[PDB]
């Protein structure tokens, strides 16, 4: 509720993000030419479905952990009640990951960083869910067309997380105050850096809900054909969030 309070919110969010982003951008850019060879890709396509789901679920969980830590350092988050902190994270941890991951996607060759190197979606054929994979690559693609800055990613991912429309929130208005302050910080920064054109091009709020949904739907199909593998080999946190 003041121009410098807002300029200052921007820096703290940007700062929170740099401290919690898991992979440094430089490194992800270095590695772009470290591409998987055809033999390696075959190696992956010939791993069993369940070995491959388990690997993907561990990576996702590593990534989600950084998202929690981002939440904790977020100005305002910890001052909410523990019901709403949980609600917000259950809903949006993954959505945030869906945005973060575009730093690791290369639009020139349609690849994504995974286990050391870059690969295309044919890398993940063993999972048996190519509609989900290609929705994720198409999402990453469409974000890469906005050429985000890190500051822009910080501010926007803070807004994804801090959504006052989530069902289950008890202290709903305290989330609106926090949201609104972050709406402002973000919009101010785009105004300062001449980037308000990107607003019209951002994904519909629908789109992140949809991909989160496909994920849950394919999970259930998998779980139903491999109940014990989920029970015995899937990270607890993954199961907390997605079962």
């Amino acid at each position: 509720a003041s121009l410098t309070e807002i300029e200052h919110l921007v820096q703290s969010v940007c700062k929170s993000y740099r401290e919690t982003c898991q992979l440094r951008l430089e490194d992800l850019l270095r590695q772009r030419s470290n591409i998987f060879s055809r033999e390696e890709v075959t190696g992956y396509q010939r791993k069993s479905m369940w070995e491959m789901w388990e690997r993907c679920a561990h990576h996702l969980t590593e990534a989600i952990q950084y998202v929690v830590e981002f939440a904790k350092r977020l100005s305002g988050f910890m001052e909410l009640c523990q019901n709403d902190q949980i609600v917000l994270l259950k809903a949006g941890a993954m959505e945030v990951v869906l945005v973060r991951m575009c730093r690791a996607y290369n639009a020139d060759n349609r690849t994504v960083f995974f286990e050391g190197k870059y690969g295309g979606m044919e890398l993940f054929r063993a999972l048996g869910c190519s509609e989900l994979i290609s929705s994720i690559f198409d999402f990453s693609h469409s974000l890469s067309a906005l050429h985000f800055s890190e500051d822009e990613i910080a501010l926007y991912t803070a807004l994804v997380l801090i959504n006052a429309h989530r069902p289950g929130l008890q202290e709903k208005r305290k989330v609106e105050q926090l949201q609104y302050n972050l709406e402002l910080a973000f919009h101010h920064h785009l105004c300062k850096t001449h980037r308000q054109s990107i607003l019209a091009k951002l994904p519909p709020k629908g789109k992140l809900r949809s991909l989160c949904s496909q994920h849950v739907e394919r999970l259930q199909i998998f779980q139903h054909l491999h109940p014990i593998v989920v029970q015995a080999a899937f990270p607890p946190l993954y199961k907390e969030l997605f079962s």
């Binding site: 952990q65 929690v68 523990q82 902190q85 949980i86 994270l89 259950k90 607890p236 969030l241």
Partner: peptide, 8 residues
Amino acid sequence: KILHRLLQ
């Protein structure tokens, strides 16, 4: 269980 623990 898990998320509560990470938050405290």
